[PDB]
Design a binder for this molecule. Structure first.
Ligand SMILES: [Mg+2]
Lengths: 744, 171, 180, 71, 57, 83
RNA sequence: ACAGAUGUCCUCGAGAGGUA
């Protein structure tokens, strides 16, 4: 269990809810196929969004049993995992499948380092295994070369643009077509596929899709949404969507912290009994719910401030909270030295905001736009307060105490660390200290603005990068009250450009012959950007893999020249994958809009591949723009199964309709306003919980063990609309008078 | 095949409804509870007849709390999947596993080793169906199914059917 | 939920008998001569598929007039049958009762007999024999052509060997069902 | 969070004027302050009682919230 | 009376003031009355379940 | 079995019966349950129970079990309360 | 892609000395 999960469970305990996973009955050896049209015990669900990376990644190269066969085993595992998730959630309106693709230049800074660290770990473990076999062979035993050559799955090879992504995308389409054809309950379900060709990080695609579904006047505000992902920030990102009917599904990491991890050798000691018990135990994986509707009430009861010149708005209150949480920690910028734990600093930042809010005469952020003087005052107050936090952290570290090593020599607890911290990154020169401080201030402000725009109003630069490795220390951004931030739109990177900007190590061989020849040659124009020994590992507090790299950045112009030089001699078949592509929408044979789609597109009109159809959410759902498919799909045809050894029956094209889906362009800026006609959920909170969250509780102090206990006693929480009227009865009369009479 | 029985259900009425209309309260409770219940011992309680006839007895007040338990005596139509008989049903789903034949409020499943070897799965036609010589079953078709399943009555009942031997087809 | 008092050492009889097979061998609770609520010694009913549809329809209309008068005091072929059944079920039972629609549709689209006189004739014809009500219910529910087909589809019918009266009342059932 | 926690205090006014004790548990507005000579616990308002130093020194009122420190 | 027990060789209990972070399963009583050595100086008023001797293992 | 109305127990209320009815009525009034008398400014459930029992306005039935197993039902209103 | 801690009560069989 992560520290963030523990923090959110301690501060907000009721957000943890139990799940109801159906177990199909087994009679006479056979397995009863579970129904899909039956009512879901976990409440009605309409929209489900799934990050396909979060399923294809754990299935491949797992920590218990690596797939012994070829990619086929991983494909079967991800197919059964997706089937289990679909049966658990049971979407009724639209099911969304998205996998990571092209990402903006800011993401390469940390993704490249993570991939290189993983590759180095794989290389060193392979060397250790080779040494183990060499020592074992000295005794006299003989091991087949197949076992020795049976290396890992090369997790670094899973990158957008590789043929593995294309093979996975081809398999996914067949799987969803088979599911739509063979399941009568999928008649109204609509499935979209966002392959690795489509740019996005997996979650930003979901944000764009939900803002495009909210880009229609007739969109129902009462629709429920579910997003499944293992990322910790996923539960936090869904709050920014301003959708009360939201809940996050994820695996129960509380049990998985100390789950079954015994060695395979012990599985044969007791023969049938122990193996049967083990296979029964791991067959069921508990999950949990991360409802956001309840969390909105907790945030409302925790962000209240008495006395304010402006008007307290719940929608605007969450904006400052999400901006501050992103500032404290995100996967786009280096961690602030002051905010390292990222858990205990949240309350300090919140009370700083509470004490500075009366001084300010305006809100923190306005629809993603950061108020420059207000944020300047906030960071000035934090820097004034950061001294006490730094002193307490140093005292705690000293009490606890009682690969380059850089932070140890800094000795931040001693007075005068302002230049001592910067000496670990640059030379000992006075004016250079000020120059680097100003540059870091400008870069950090630009990065904060860029991440706010990306997570609120979508991508705005697509090429911005962070040209630094160490975040500025406390009392930063002293004078910056004159800069104006205005980002420029840039074209997304090509799949090959993004793949080489990820910069896999020499172990990776997903590149074609030309690119690997241009790399492996000792006299390479970009050989300086590709280390071999990788000695850039550096601790900087923390431990284990949490250390960051210090390798030099990559110049975009050199990589562009390299790709433009390698392009002309590449084969046309391989170059055919350079197309950005568009998401593909799949609908059932008996869909409400199926007749209209079959009469408009792929019909007797026989237009020259330029007719598009725009439809609203009044009929069926999934508002958007559909276009002619660019693949080989055609009416009265057949689709070849790519799984091969999967015993999957072939299907015809008359059962599944395939077309290219394009999101509706945003007319105006995506504001944060609750849509009219939204029906609030049932009132579940009590004033006691409001007081509990208003008073500062030191993790409940373990006075009565209220943190952990009858967790299952919280039961399920009702979801969906509750009551025709969207306004709670306050004073008034008639209906409110009758309610008061029946209550009192 | 449906049976008319004389079942009994115990309802623990709360003292908050100990008024002149507690009888009608028990009546509506019995309706809202017994209907749609998939009891393992009996099956489905489709409907309760003679609503204005069912009688209640003196409710015994429990020693623990003031709630009173009433032993009602109702009669209703009960459907049980049973075992060892032929029955007619209508398909509602089809897949490689089998066809989901529906008889009344039931969904009897047929596995691979149940039907004879004269059925092969294919998706060439508009409905995904098992097609072979002189056998035509589809999403909506007539089929006679013989039940030989173990039911497995655990808070709900099920059924497994067979297609072996003649007369178990469309006809 | 039970209707029969404990007897014949129910506590620890272990496996008294295997579950009901094709050759009759009824269950412990569904045995003949059930205990009547008011008295005792009540035989099991002989209810067929067509009889079930009429019985449930009669109960529905009885409850319909019941709560219709209560609220008043307080204040083609298959196509026509489906609409009438839907409009009757929309408010009579209330609640959810999803399974009621499916069984009503099954009764309507598989109604062997659609007249009170027809079902009266068929059960007055079937009461002549001493067969188990389970056997007569299946005989009157599923139409049959040959004697061997009836024996195979409906087992535990080996007591009839002559097959002359069996052919006679099979033809009677066939013409009654075609007289719908 | 609360300043009045483990700091020696002197009870003012009421029937325990001039008494010396240490506040152990504080909740809401009432503060539970133990007694040195007497083996009993008395709950009084935190504002009423003055605040002293653990080692010894001048006494101050509840203005410790502004100072956010001791002494 | 309190004592230090030498479990094994290097697993020996020590008299010191415990903290909520490094140590685990602390008592519900207060610990401010303790000193650096883990022993309360004479002349300090105590009541209830206050900790007088601070030992960790 | 129930002895019709040829009952042969005592036409009065025993002390144990009085205690049991008083306790049951007190619990029922303590929970949200209807009261069939005029509270008249009483707010203790036990006293409300005694007030209800004063004019025999308690809708409770006593089932006196014979040692063999038979039982006869006695209404509260028909039971004489002399103790 | 991802991921470093906490939940409140421990004796148990005996022995001895006493109180109503
Ligand atoms: Mg992420």
């Amino acid at each position: 269990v992560p520290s963030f999960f523990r923090w959110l469970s301690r501060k907000y305990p009721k957000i943890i809810s139990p799940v109801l996973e159906e177990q199909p009955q087994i009679v006479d050896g056979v397995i009863l196929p579970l129904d899909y049209s039956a009512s879901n015990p976990n409440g009605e669900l309409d929209n489900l969004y799934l990050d396909m990376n979060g399923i294809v990644h754990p299935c491949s190269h797992p920590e218990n049993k690596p797939p012994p066969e070829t990619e086929d085993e991983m494909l079967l595992a991800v197919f059964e995992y997706t089937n289990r998730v679909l049966n658990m959630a049971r979407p009724r309106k639209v099911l969304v499948m998205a996998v990571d693709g092209v990402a903006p230049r800011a993401k390469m800074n940390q993704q490249r380092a993570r991939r290189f660290r993983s590759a180095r770990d794989a290389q060193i473990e392979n060397e250790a295994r080779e040494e183990i076999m060499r020592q074992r062979e000295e005794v006299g035993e003989i091991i087949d070369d197949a076992v020795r050559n049976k290396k890992t799955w090369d997790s670094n090879a899973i990158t957008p643009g590789t043929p593995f992504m294309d093979k996975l995308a081809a398999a996914l389409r067949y799987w969803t077509a088979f599911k739509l054809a063979t399941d009568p309950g999928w008649k109204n379900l609509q499935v979209i596929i966002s392959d690795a060709t489509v740019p996005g990080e997996g979650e930003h695609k979901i944000m764009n899709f939900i803002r495009s579904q909210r880009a229609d006047p007739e969109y129902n505000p009462n629709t429920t949404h579910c997003i499944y992902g293992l990322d910790a920030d996923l539960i936090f990102l869904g709050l920014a969507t301003h959708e009360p009917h939201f809940k996050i599904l994820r695996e129960d990491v509380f049990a998985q912290d100390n789950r079954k991890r015994n060695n395979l050798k012990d599985t044969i000691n007791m023969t049938e009994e122990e193996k049967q018990f083990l296979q029964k135990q791991n067959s069921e994986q508990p999950f949990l719910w991360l409802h956001i509707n309840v969390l909105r009430e907790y945030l409302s009861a925790e962000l209240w401030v008495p006395g304010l010149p402006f008007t307290f708005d719940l929608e605007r209150a969450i904006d400052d909270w999400v901006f501050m949480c992103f500032f404290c920690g995100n996967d786009f910028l280096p961690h602030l030295p002051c905010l390292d734990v990222r858990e205990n600093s949240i309350d300090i930042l919140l009370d700083i905001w509470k004490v500075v809010l009366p001084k300010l005469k305006t809100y923190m952020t306005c629809d993603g736009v950061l108020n420059l003087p207000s944020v300047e005052t906030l960071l000035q107050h934090l820097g004034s307060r950061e001294g006490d936090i730094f002193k307490t952290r140093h005292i705690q570290e000293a009490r606890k105490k009682e690969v380059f090593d850089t932070d140890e020599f800094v000795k931040l607890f001693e007075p005068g660390y302002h230049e001592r911290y910067y000496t670990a990154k640059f030379h000992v020169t006075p004016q250079d200290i000020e120059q680097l401080r100003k540059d870091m201030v400008k870069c950090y402000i630009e990065g904060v603005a860029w991440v706010l725009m990306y997570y609120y109003q979508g991508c705005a630069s697509w090429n911005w990068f962070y040209p630094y490795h160490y975040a500025p220390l406390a009392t930063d951004f002293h004078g910056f009250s004159h800069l104006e931030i205005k980002f420029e739109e840039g074209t997304p990177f090509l799949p090959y450009e993004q793949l080489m900007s990820v910069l896999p190590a020499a172990s990776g061989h997903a590149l074609p012959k030309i690119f690997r020849s241009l790399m492996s040659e000792p006299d390479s124009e970009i050989i300086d950007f590709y280390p071999e020994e990788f000695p850039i590992d550096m601790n900087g507090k923390k431990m284990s893999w949490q250390g960051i790299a210090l390798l030099p950045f990559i110049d975009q112009d050199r990589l562009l020249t390299a790709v433009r030089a390698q392009y002309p001699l590449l084969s046309d078949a391989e170059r055919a994958r350079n197309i950005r592509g568009e998401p593909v929408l799949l609908i059932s044979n008996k869909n409400a809009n199926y007749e209209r789609f079959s009469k408009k597109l792929y019909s007797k009109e026989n237009n020259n591949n330029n007719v598009v159809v725009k439809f609203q959410h009044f009929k069926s759902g999934l508002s958007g723009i559909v276009s002619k498919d660019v693949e080989g799909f055609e009416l009265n045809g057949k689709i070849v199964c790519p799984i091969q050894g999967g015993s999957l029956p072939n299907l015809s094209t008359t059962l599944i309709l395939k077309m290219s889906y394009r999101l509706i362009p945003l007319p105006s800026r995506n504001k944060s306003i609750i849509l009219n006609g939204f029906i609030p959920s049932e009132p579940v909170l009590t004033a006691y919980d409001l007081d509990s969250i208003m008073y500062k509780y030191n993790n409940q102090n373990y006075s009565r063990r209220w943190n952990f206990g009858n967790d299952l006693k919280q039961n399920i929480v009702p979801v969906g609309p509750k009551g025709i009227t969207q306004y709670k009865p306050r004073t008034g009369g008639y209906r409110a008078f009758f309610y008061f009479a029946e209550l009192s | 095949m449906f049976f008319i029985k004389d079942l009994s259900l115990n309802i623990t009425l709360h003292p908050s409804f100990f008024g002149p209309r507690m009888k009608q309260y028990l009546k509506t409770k019995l309706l809202e509870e017994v209907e749609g219940s998939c009891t393992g011992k009996f099956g489905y309680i489709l409907c309760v007849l003679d609503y204005d006839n069912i009688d209640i007895q003196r409710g015994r007040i429990l020693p623990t709390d003031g709630s009173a338990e009433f032993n009602v005596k109702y009669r209703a139509v009960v459907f049980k999947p049973f075992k060892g008989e032929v029955v007619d049903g209508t398909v509602v789903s089809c897949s490689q596993h089998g066809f989901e034949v529906q008889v009344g409020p039931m969904k009897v499943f047929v596995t691979k080793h149940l039907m004879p070897q004269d059925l092969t799965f294919n998706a060439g036609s508009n409905p995904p169906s098992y097609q072979s010589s002189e056998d035509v079953i589809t999403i909506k078709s007539r089929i006679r199914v013989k039940i030989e399943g173990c039911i497995s009555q655990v808070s709900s009942i099920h059924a497994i059917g067979s297609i072996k031997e003649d007369y178990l087809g469309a006809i | 939920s039970t209707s029969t008092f404990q007897t014949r050492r129910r506590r620890l009889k272990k496996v008294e008998e295997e579950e009901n097979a094709a050759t009759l061998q009824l269950g412990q609770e569904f045995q003949l001569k059930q205990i009547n609520h008011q008295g005792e010694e009540e035989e099991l009913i002989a209810l067929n598929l067509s009889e079930a549809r009429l019985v449930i329809k009669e109960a529905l209309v009885e409850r319909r007039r019941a709560f219709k008068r209560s609220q008043k005091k307080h204040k083609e072929t298959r196509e026509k049958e489906l609409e009438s059944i839907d409009v009757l079920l929309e408010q009579t039972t209330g609640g959810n009762n999803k399974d009621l629609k499916n069984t009503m549709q099954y009764l309507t689209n598989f109604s062997r007999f659609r007249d009170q006189e027809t079902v009266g004739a068929v059960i007055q014809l079937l009461k002549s024999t001493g067969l188990h009500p389970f056997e007569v219910a299946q005989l009157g529910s599923l139409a049959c052509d040959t004697a061997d087909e009836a024996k195979t589809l409906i087992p535990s019918l080996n007591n009839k060997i002559s097959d002359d009266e069996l052919e006679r009342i099979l033809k009677e059932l066939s013409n009654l069902e075609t007289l719908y | 969070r609360e300043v009045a926690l483990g700091k020696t205090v002197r009870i003012r006014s009421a029937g325990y004027k001039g008494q010396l004790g240490i506040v152990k548990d504080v909740n809401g507005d009432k503060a539970t302050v133990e007694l040195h000579s007497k083996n009993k616990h008395i709950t009084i308002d935190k504002h009423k009682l003055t605040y002293y130093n653990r080692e010894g020194g001048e006494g101050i009122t509840y203005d410790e919230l502004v100072n956010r420190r001791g002494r | 009376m309190d004592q230090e027990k030498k479990y094994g060789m290097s697993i020996t209990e020590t008299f010191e003031k415990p903290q909520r972070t490094n140590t685990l399963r602390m008592k519900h009583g207060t610990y401010d009355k303790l000193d650096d050595d883990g022993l309360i100086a004479p002349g300090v008023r105590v009541s209830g379940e206050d900790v007088i001797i601070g030992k960790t293992t | 079995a129930i002895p019709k109305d040829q009952r042969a127990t005592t036409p009065y209320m025993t002390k144990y019966e009085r205690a049991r009815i008083l306790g049951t009525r007190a619990l029922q009034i303590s929970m949200n349950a209807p009261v069939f008398v005029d509270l008249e400014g009483e707010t203790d459930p036990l006293r409300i129970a005694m007030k209800e029992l004063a004019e025999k306005k308690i809708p409770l039935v006593i089932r006196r079990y014979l040692p063999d197993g038979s039982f006869e039902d006695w209404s509260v209103e028909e039971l004489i309360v002399d103790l």
